[PDB]
């Protein structure tokens, strides 16, 4: 028979501290092992657990995975999620003479922003660039950043930085353009942003 490995959900976004559940299934129960991996952007895979066909579970730290070979299922449980768990999680099985990977769960574990202070700032132009650059920062993790209505305005997705020695984390998104009818006041107009967002005078 043809092996098919299915993983759900395709993507999971959750607040830090929550437990989470990742599902894997395989239609051909004649496997020798099941493995779980994580993969970070721009890197290879790291092995997290290997469950032999004769085993029902494996545990490592906050990770526990079950295997029900005859049902064709494995569940990966991640306790008390942390931002550094953010990665793509891959399920693989070893068949008699083939190996098969699922399509992955892309996990994003969001920081709890204790003191949100949403604001849109204009950065200084570069004497070596022709772009105008705007920074939406310090918003809570429930805020979603949308793409611009305009094809020559570029907006990145929210990115979390950690200022370790101040125990401070913050979200931001960058918007830029080199068109002239462009204002940081309006750069994020296609996003639902907090009504209390600070817009300093320019």
């Amino acid at each position: 028979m043809k092996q098919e490995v299915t993983q759900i959900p395709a993507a999971l976004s959750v607040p830090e501290g929550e437990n989470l559940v990742l599902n894997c299934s395989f239609t051909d129960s004649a496997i020798y092992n099941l493995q779980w991996f994580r993969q970070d952007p721009g890197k290879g895979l790291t092995s997290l657990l290997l469950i032999q066909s004769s085993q029902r579970e494996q545990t490592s730290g906050r990770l526990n995975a079950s295997l029900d070979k005859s049902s064709g299922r494995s569940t990966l449980y991640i306790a008390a999620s942390q931002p550094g768990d953010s990665a793509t999680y891959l399920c693989a099985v070893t068949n008699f003479n083939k190996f098969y990977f699922g399509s992955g769960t892309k996990l994003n574990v969001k920081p709890n922003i204790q003191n949100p202070d949403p604001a849109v700032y204009q950065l200084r132009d570069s004497k070596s660039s022709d772009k105008s650059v705007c920074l939406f920062t310090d918003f809570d993790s429930q805020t979603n950043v949308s793409q611009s209505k305009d094809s020559d305005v570029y907006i990145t997705d929210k990115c979390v930085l950690d200022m370790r020695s101040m125990d401070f984390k913050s979200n931001s998104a960058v918007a830029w353009s080199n068109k002239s009818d462009f204002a940081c006041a309006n750069a994020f107009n296609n996003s639902i942003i907090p009504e209390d967002t600070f817009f300093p005078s320019p």
Binding site: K43, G44, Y100, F101, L135, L161
Partner: protein
């Protein structure tokens, strides 16, 4: 520290019809070496596995994808008659025994196959200095680095403060944005942020640098365009702190 799985080369740009050979060295003590192709469209697909110099298992790729293993367990793979759809991360994994021991992956060889080398451009890189309003409101200062107009997506962006690589206070986009999303050969843009205290930004002796390594054409690639040959290179931008 001991070596992980190693792969050479790191990055390749090729034109259609060419061939490439890739090498992988397993972790010392590992004898099973496996190759996988990772693409956005098909995900992670098995090529073949070697043990003690012979192919033990194989996937479903056509014969223009080939492999081999030497007596010291080093393995090569070859792809002939390259096509646009062969652009991928080619991953090596070693294991003591793939039947019952974990796979350990390398970081891959990134291959981009393009119609024409005239599609290849290095990034332009700029640093944008912090907002005065951010500094007065938060007593923090965010620098932005933009790397724009590059193709292929074979870049590594890093921040350096007074000569030391920094990770605290940094966030770089996990993927680039396509400048023209409809096109297969679109150039890319990437953003990153570095946030420091206002006190640190206000010292004019502090020096900030955003570095982008771009992996481009070989010395053996022909180049007949007027613009500078888009060779492997670093493109950088810098700033110094400012009292006011």
């Amino acid at each position: 520290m001991k070596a992980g799985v190693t792969q050479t080369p790191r990055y390749l740009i090729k034109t259609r019809g060419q061939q490439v050979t890739l090498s992988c060295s397993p972790i010392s003590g590992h004898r099973s070496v496996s190759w996988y192709q990772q693409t956005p469209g098909q995900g992670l697909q098995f090529l073949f596995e070697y043990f003690s110099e012979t192919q033990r298992n194989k996937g479903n790729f056509p014969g223009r994808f080939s492999g081999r293993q030497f007596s010291n367990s080093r393995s090569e793979m070859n792809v002939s008659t390259l096509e646009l759809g062969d652009s991928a991360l080619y991953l090596c994994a070693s294991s003591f025994d793939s039947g019952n021991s974990p796979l350990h992956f390398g970081n891959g060889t990134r291959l981009t196959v393009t119609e024409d080398l005239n599609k290849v451009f290095p990034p332009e890189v700029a640093v944008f200095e912090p907002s005065e309003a951010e500094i007065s409101h938060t007593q923090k200062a965010t620098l932005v680095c933009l790397a724009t107009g590059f193709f292929p997506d074979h870049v590594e962006l890093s921040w350096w403060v007074n000569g030391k690589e920094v990770h605290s206070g940094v966030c770089t986009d996990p993927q680039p944005l396509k400048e023209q999303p409809a096109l297969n050969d679109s150039r890319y843009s990437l953003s990153s942020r570095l946030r420091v205290s206002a006190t640190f930004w206000q010292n004019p002796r502090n020096h900030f640098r955003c570095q982008v390594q771009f992996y481009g054409l070989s010395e053996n690639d022909e180049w007949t365009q007027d613009r500078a040959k888009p060779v492997t290179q670093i493109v950088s931008a810098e700033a110094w702190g400012r009292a006011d």
